[PDB]
Nucleic acid binder design. Structure first.
Length: 67
DNA sequence: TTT
């Protein structure tokens, strides 16, 4: 019905009292090619939090715009 | 705290 795989870890932005982390990763959803993904994760990364997926073009637009 |  839905699958995910963290293909590459890029950056951790913060971690909270319960060990969950806000991360920028490259994530493959439903076997698609990996996309940038900014999201909260459980300590062992087996539970997903709320977040956003960005295409390469969307992520490059953001990076170009703020630095 | 699930695309």
């Amino acid at each position: 019905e839905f699958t995910f795989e963290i293909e590459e870890h890029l950056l951790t932005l913060s971690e909270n009292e319960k060990g969950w982390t806000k991360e920028i990763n490259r994530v493959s959803f439903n076997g698609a090619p990996a996309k940038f993904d900014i999201r909260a994760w459980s300590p062992d990364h087996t539970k997903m939090g709320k977040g956003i997926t960005l295409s390469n073009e969307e992520f490059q637009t953001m990076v170009d715009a703020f630095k």
